[PDB]
Amino acid sequence: LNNMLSQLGITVPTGTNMQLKNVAAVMVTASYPPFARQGQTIDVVVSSMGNAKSLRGGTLL
């Protein structure tokens, strides 16, 4: 999250609490189909990585 914020233009100090509960680290897996074209879209599967309780209405970024 800090890396994303720094890339977007916000640099959080290294020593900070940063105790958030609305985000979850996830791994996304996809099946690259044969003859895949540049503009096409595919379905993905998102699975929690840490100790997140649920991903009910989350958004993958």
Add this chain to the structure above:
Amino acid sequence: NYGYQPLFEDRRPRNIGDTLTIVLQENVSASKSSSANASRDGKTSFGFDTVPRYLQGL
């Protein structure tokens, strides 16, 4: 710049112009020792100070 940039990665240097921070923290220490010794001592004695009459010949 039109290049692609990841959001969640650790922003490692990737191209020629990228800059990186180096912490030297170098510490090397080597030691070597060797020794050798050799001592020999000998000391022999023999004396009568009184010789029997029958042994005076030798």
